[PDB]
Design a protein around this ligand. Sequence first.
Ligand SMILES: Cc1[nH]c(-c2cc(N)ccc2Cl)c2c1C(=O)CC=CC2
Length: 127
Amino acid sequence: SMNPPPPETSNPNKPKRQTNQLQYLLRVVLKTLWKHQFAWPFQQPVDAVKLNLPDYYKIIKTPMDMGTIKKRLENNYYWNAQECIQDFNTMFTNCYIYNKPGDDIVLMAEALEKLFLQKINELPTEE
Ligand SMILES: Cc1[nH]c(-c2cc(N)ccc2Cl)c2c1C(=O)CC=CC2
C-alpha cells in the first residue's frame, strides 16, 4: 500500500546523446501530450496512498509516467529515441493492465496514445 521510490531520472554513469530524434521527443511528443486535457493523471507517478490503490504497485512492476519521462529528457538520460518511446509505451500498457476495460482512465490513456502514435509516425531521420 506504500509508494515505491520513483523510477530513476538521473544516472551519471549511463552514457547519453543529444540527437534530433531525442530533441523531437521532447519538443514535439512530450509537449503535445503534456498540454492535452487528459494529461494530468499521467504527469506524475501514481500516488497509491492518496488514491487509496494499495494493489497498484502489487500489479504494476515497471511504473512509468510523463513526469518521469520529462525529467529523463531534460536530464539527457537517454541514449536513443527507442528508450524514450518504450517509456511512453510502458506507461500506456500499465494503464491498460491495471484498469478495467471501458474505464475513463483507459480512455484518457487511449487519447494520449493516439496522439503519441501520430507524432512517432513522423519521427525525423537521424543526423
Ligand atoms: C495512470 C493513472 N494515473 C492516476 C492518477 C495519478 C495521480 N498522481 C493523481 C490522479 C490520478 Cl487519477 C491513476 C492511474 C491509474 O491507472 C489508476 C486509476 C486512477 C489513478
